[PDB]
């Protein structure tokens, strides 16, 4: 019981409990998915409603023209990382005058989220992320964690009950490469419904998406622009 | 330096340090005040007088500026600070705004100090409840009360410190519009108010008055004794 | 007491933030409502004694000409945000020469909600989160807007909200009586009808306060003379 | 230079068992007088004085720092300050300012509290301690006060002769200085007592 | 008291009811955890270090595993204690030895290098933020005035030069043999010292060390530079153990 | 950074718990006696080793702070090297400003104020060393005792370490005025003989004196001269 | 930072009274008993000495009676260690006042300047408070003679006659009965302080070594702080001892 | 009872537990090995695939600290990416200060000191990452240095870090690697790993290897496609 309260205290098993508890913060929030073809990379985030009267949180944030993120975790805590990511992408266009490589941008997050896990008296950022981007090496989908360990992934799902959405992405993995703009998005939309119970369906209000690709900059479709993709998909 | 959370929340949502700070006020020296027409009166009881004390240095009714005075009930070590911090703001206001200090303006600044010291790293909440009184421009009397939490209100009549509950029970009944018509009955209302906290005593009662542009005036034990002579 | 301010509970939520929301339940009831023609704001003063002056208690403050506000919970903690929100609105009007939208105001105050911390901080950092929940009504080029803020730093757009001592009792009856295009004068009545029952002391002109804002008219608070006609139609 | 703004003169001459310090009374700005009441000689306590010259700002600025540091030293220690220790204090005070020096040339005169032992010295802008067995001078007229003190000074003198010697030393040296004048104040430090006299000098 | 504990005394370093410091007591036990021993004997013209060298696995490189370091050209070192803490102080000793020559402009003496190291281990004792180091340094060397010098530094901060030292698992017993030969006061030469020093370890451990089981650093007046004797030079002294 | 919170706090009884135990460390240290008599102040500490392999010239308890001041200790050994290195700077910082050797009264005042800083400033324990500072100034000797609390006294004769209670009792019945520095060294060593057990050689006892000649530590050959019980 | 080791010296109690302040007053409760009496002419301080032995030198000064300024002095009841920190602060405060305003510091101004230092340590910083409660004497150009008593919490006030330290409660009850407002003279005040102590001394016979008196008078525009030598102290005792019978 | 709560405390037996606990973080990590030969140094790593969703090559455990220096980590990969970035700062500070290739013996010191500075205080936690550093130079030769959470550096002919050690450290002893050539070592490295790797808890992995030595002219590289395929097939043929 004494090993729990501090970040810098190990255990007899070599497990840091606070970093484990910070992983629970990701499971406490809405599920998000994303995947990439040979060209496009699309994030699909489920905007959760506090009530039917109140509106929905924004789970997708712009970073740079070619880069976008889907935040799952503490909402105001993700705006600390998003503000860091926007400054790194501006400093890349201000200095090198080139779009920042996505594999570099995720490495800077691994350096920023590593420090609070190392030092006493601080907490690890409780936000998981999916960074979708496009660069000279092709589209990328990167998962991060509170533990600061970042991955390189074809498709992932984070958030509450994300394991089921991950299972769906594995079966269709072979088809993800040749999908066009429309069909690619439909793969992610079919993943979200698996996370939520059948008593709730997908609507124009509670689902937001973003798309980055070869000739297309990262753009967020809010509500009315989500409907044309929602239509044509059987539930 | 030393940076650590002293004031923190609780499973019931209560702040312990802020509630325990108000416990210091809950045993004070009882301080009261009322508002008249052109006059406003403050009063305080001192049970600690052994006749060996110097009454002038222990006075708990101070003056922040020409147009504003104040009292307090609580731990006296903390009042010197707030007062010396408030008096700096009064003069820095006249330096920023050539007009004098509004009674409300100095009550905000006293409250903004009791806030910052609640949320700051490695601090302690003040244990004083200050009662501020003055005349705003156009000559309207104003009476305020602060809180160790930083919450300031206004009052027509008020009581703070030990036994402040029983005093309000007398004030709420006997405060009317037919009252506070003359400067004497306004003072006679304060002395009657302290009768609930009288120990079979009252030679220890301290009073202060403010009228129009005239500065604060503290009544001597002789002037108050004449007001006490009329009871029945 | 054994558990820093930044410690995560095993459930994945910060203690101090979990406890801060427990402090909103002790505040005063504040009811915002949004309408295509404006935003209405009403809050209970909670007068604790006859000798207290009701005119000195203002729980509805004007953040800017186009933006109102409301507060519940600790009133002391609200002043730090309100004085910060007013600076950010004027910083925007000064720099970009335009009225800051209600959206950017919340992003200004919501950034300060998680700034609390102990080590690796400045002398200006805070040891605890704010115990206050704010409701920003306002009108911009996007029309009348109403937002909600909690200690966790999450700002949420809303058509209407209820905060303070009873949120549940008010939110239950508020979602019902609020329908679509319903205008200001109808909203004010529905706001008081909810508010009059959820409080304890009877409805008086000085017992509670009321505010409103319109697209063509600056933020306005109804005086006692105007409220006496409004409470007459209850 | 800058030290010639307000002018001023300070002199100290050591006798046998006694010392004497003198300075003029004039306060003025360049070519214009203001008042004759200015004080260039300050008490350090019994049988110890210090003069100050140069810019009149630093005369009062450096002095208020010495009574600041002296009273701290005399309260910490159980004894009065030795005049030799005070020389090193003012030297350390002026040297910390090396790159923004006070403009002044302190002149210290007094008696060793032990028994009879007299002590005098002078300093510079940077505060190089300089101990002399005869006399020290500082000011804009310093060049004058050298020649006067050279001829008049003798190895051992009783208090009566110090005053006559230091009086005519200042009065004649100041009359040839334009920015100094308006009366002279002379202090006499004996073992028994202290004699202060303000001389009647040419007003000019 | 006699071992009574009050509050946090046994966790950080603060005085207990009996006045002791338990954290420093346990630092002495961190030396015995190294699982080895070391002996440095000071002869007339020479100061010899004999270290038990354990290479249990054949994959372990023998050239990279040594307890004999070089602090500066004329000052040798042998670190008995936690291997992690050993290279911590050696890197710090080399900085202090080089900083000494950047300020004072001459090679640091052995006695004053143990003083600046033991004074740093005093900082860790008072400050409750951090623990003391668990390594015990033994320095040898020759100063051009006092000749051969053998000093020792405990983690407590108490440094004392010895005639003959010991460290690690076997110390008291290893010193009991050193009391026998030093009291007899033989004539100490370079060959006479190394033969006795190696015998000291063999008497305690009952081994008769092989050439690859030890490494011997030596410093002499003729050879002021610190040198490590090669396996061939070691075996030349091992045949003398067949003799006397 | 480090701990900014004070490790010393008032007990419910009103007595500081840290310092109370710091005085229990000096009770079990090396026995140390000193005497202020006539023109000098003698300081005699018993240095008792466990072996014949320990080199004596390497380590000395008695240490000079400056020419006119000297210092011994009873308590934690390593902690003593921290004060000396601080006391030697305070004597120099004084000598730079005032260009005279620091008087013992002013040094013990500043040294004991450093020992007060660690009874308040956070993240540090108080010293485990109870000093004896001998000094000679203005023809008047000075013998002071600074303890971990920071409260310094002025003693004619005092004893520390093992059997310090039995040490002071032997001082009262012996110590007097008109007592030469000679007899002081004699009476100092006689006190240790009641404390120390076993034969006392020049290696066992370490003595030093402070007088008009300045503070000097006696060499083992000179200490052997006093071990004859003459002088 | 390891809170575990933090004792939280600045927090309130459940009843709203700082612990480290109350425990500091019990440290002062067992310290040396000091008292003071304000008369028509002069004010005195009688300090009891709790360290007495044949081997003590008594080299410096009054031993627990200090001098803050030319016009002021103080006694000390509490931890002897922490008093030397305050005294070095009070001597800086009076000299910073004299630096700006070039006049002696009034007693009201110096006391409230130190109590701000006793607040910073009780309010914040986490460091322990001061275990020293002080008495003050002095004269100023305005209110005349002054007698002030602070505490570890920084709460001071004026007093005509007061006491501090061990048996401070039993002494004040004696002053209240004997002390007459405006009728006390320094000759009648010294005879009063001795009668008060002789009852409150834990050791009888009232030796001249234990109690030492310090008086403050103003003469010829100069404040005179004198510590009565053991000769004159014993003379006052014997004059008081004959008045018990004869 | 409280002695293990911070890295600033000794147990009553003298052990520092918070450092011993960080070592167990490596004991549960996957196994990585390294080997020296006459020609150069060869690396190998078992990189476990936690899900098919992960791209091939993700969570790469072989870091390039400098052109001529390779690195292989076993432990918590979050702290490893901090070390690899800090090890690059030391190689770049060396390149800036001394203007040539950093000798591996010195690079395994500065890094093993930084790993050590976090075992002293109570405000930080020990690294849970154990890692080895191989390098080759024509004027030096094959060099391999392991660093552990405590900051201990040893040279090795071959070593095993992570979960399986005593099993892998016995299999390396049987073969004599001193006179062998790197091209024949690569085939033996993969042979050792598949013998060491047994599937009970975990499922699948991706074999990673590295060249540094005479073949690469001193520049540390991953094994090229054809050679990696040439080497992996031999270990499968030799499997039975």
Numbering used by the authors:
A (entry chain C): 4 to 238
B (entry chain A): 2 to 233
C (entry chain B): 8 to 241
D (entry chain H): 2 to 205
E (entry chain E): 2 to 245
F (entry chain F): 4 to 234
G (entry chain G): 1 to 246
H (entry chain D): 6 to 245
Paper's wording?
Proteasome activity is fine-tuned as a result of the association of the proteolytic CP with diverse proteasomal activators (PAs), including PA700, PA28, and PA200, that can induce the opening of the CP gate into the central proteolytic cavity, allowing substrates to be degraded. In contrast, PA28 (also called 11S or REG in most organisms, and PA26 in Trypanosoma brucei, TbPA26) stimulates the degradation of peptides in an ATP/ubiquitin-independent manner. However, lymphoid cells and cells exposed to cytokines such as IFN-γ alternatively express three homologous subunits (β1i/LMP2, β2i/MECL-1, and β5i/LMP7), replacing the constitutive ones, in the 20S immunoproteasome (iCP) particles—with this alternative expression resulting in a change in the proteolytic activities. We determine the uncharacterized cryo-EM structures of free bovine iCP and the single- and double-capped PA28αβ-iCP and PA28αβ-iCP-PA28αβ to resolutions of 3.3, 4.1, and 4.2 Å, respectively.
Our MS analysis also showed that the abundance of immune-β subunits, indicated by peptide-spectrum-matches value, is obviously higher (>70%) than that of standard-β subunits, suggesting that iCP is the main proteasome CP purified from bovine spleen, while cCP is rather less populated. For the free iCP, dominant portion of the map showed local resolution levels better than 3.0 Å, revealing sidechain densities for most of the amino acids. Note that the unambiguous assignment of amino-acid sidechains here enabled us to confirm that the isolated bovine spleen 20S proteasome was indeed mostly immunoproteasome, for instance, for these distinct regions between iCP and cCP, overall iCP model fits into our cryo-EM map better, only rare locations imply the partial contribution from the signal of cCP in addition to the dominant signal from iCP. Our free iCP map showed a closed-gate configuration with ordered and well-resolved N termini of the α2, α3, α4, and to a lesser extent α5 subunits showing extended conformations covering the gate region; while the N termini of the remaining α6, α7, and α1 subunits were observed to point away from the pore and to approximately align with the central axis of the iCP, thus not participating in blocking the iCP pore. For instance, relative to cCP, in iCP the C-terminal tail of β1i and a linker region (Gly133-Leu139) both showed conformational rearrangement, the C-terminal loop of β2i exhibited a slight outward displacement, and the β5i H3 displayed an observable outward shift. Furthermore, for bovine proteasome, the patterns of surface property in the catalytic pockets of β1i were observed to be different from those of β1, with this difference mainly resulting from the difference between β1-Thr31 and β1i-Phe31.
